Amino acid sequence: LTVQSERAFQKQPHIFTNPKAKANKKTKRWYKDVGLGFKTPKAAIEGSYIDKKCPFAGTVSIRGKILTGTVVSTKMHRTIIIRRDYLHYVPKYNRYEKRHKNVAAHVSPAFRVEEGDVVTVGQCRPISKTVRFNVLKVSAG
């Protein structure tokens, strides 16, 4: 896995590394905290990946609803699907029935998720036809 794997050069926007500088030849990296008491993974501070839709190094912002669910598919590139289980109340029978909804969320390379983990995802702006949420926390399962 390499960062410059596309026909275009991959880089963080407006982050300029001046070649006429001192001997500290370390590529300047930009990052941000998403807020809401969520910790920035050190794979973002020390990593090299470029992801414009990542919450920490990209331009997306986390705002709205925070959801939790179970990862059921990692077969897409940089995108996962989580499964949310809930109980629906049926007043006539004074009982419940199990229901579920699938919500698609984007996962940045700063996280590594496999099928079976329980993740917490935060809402972001629409970044695809079906993806509007972005992973904020991972719990191993």
């Binding site: 410059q4 596309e6 026909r7 275009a8 050069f9 880089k11 300029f16 590394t17 001046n18 070649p19 006429k20 698609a104 036809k129 079906t130």
Partner: protein, 184 residues
């Protein structure tokens, strides 16, 4: 009319959606500028809210910046040598964003020689130059190009949106990257 609505698509489950309403004016699109190189021709577009956009259909020059020294000059664009999106854009020399072009090197060589005193390609003024000396050694792979008189640059402005074709000169590993991509 060209429409950007997502209603005409089928849903994530694959179901075709029935026709909900007639096309609305607040979701229109227009046609691409497909900017070429030729005598300057820009047409304005009246957009929502009464604002204005500028379609650059053909331009010759643009303002390109040499980032390390922080100086920008307006220079002609010779042609498009590489485009990460579509090779038909390289073949027809269509100016879009992120297009790799060759620009005239004279304004930058002239600034360099007046500012540092060295050449490229390979009392007070003299004191100012002696102070500025030492920082005048630039990378070999960028310096060699001035001999050919043409610098590699990438367009940063959006010509179909502002009518301008502006950009910056390639340097560092980005420059090494597109040289390797171009030569193959």
């Amino acid at each position: 009319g060209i429409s950007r609505d997502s209603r005409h698509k089928r849903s994530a489950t694959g179901a075709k959606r029935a026709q909900f309403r007639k096309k609305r004016k607040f979701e229109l699109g227009r046609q691409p500028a497909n900017t070429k190189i030729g005598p300057k021709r820009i047409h304005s577009v009246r957009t929502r809210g009464g604002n204005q956009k500028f379609r650059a259909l053909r331009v010759e020059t643009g303002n390109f910046s040499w980032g390390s020294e922080g100086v920008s000059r307006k220079t002609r664009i010779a042609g498009v040598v590489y485009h990460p999106s579509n090779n038909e854009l390289v073949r027809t020399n269509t100016l879009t964003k992120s297009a790799v072009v060759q620009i005239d090197a004279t304004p930058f060589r002239q600034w360099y020689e007046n500012h540092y005193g060295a050449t490229l390609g390979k009392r007070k003024v003299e004191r100012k130059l002696a102070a500025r000396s030492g920082a005048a050694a630039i990378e070999s792979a960028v310096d060699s190009q001035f001999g050919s008189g043409r610098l590699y640059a990438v367009i940063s402005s959006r010509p179909g949106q502002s009518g301008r074709c502006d950009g910056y000169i390639l340097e560092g590993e980005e420059l090494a990257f597109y040289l390797r991509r171009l030569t193959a």
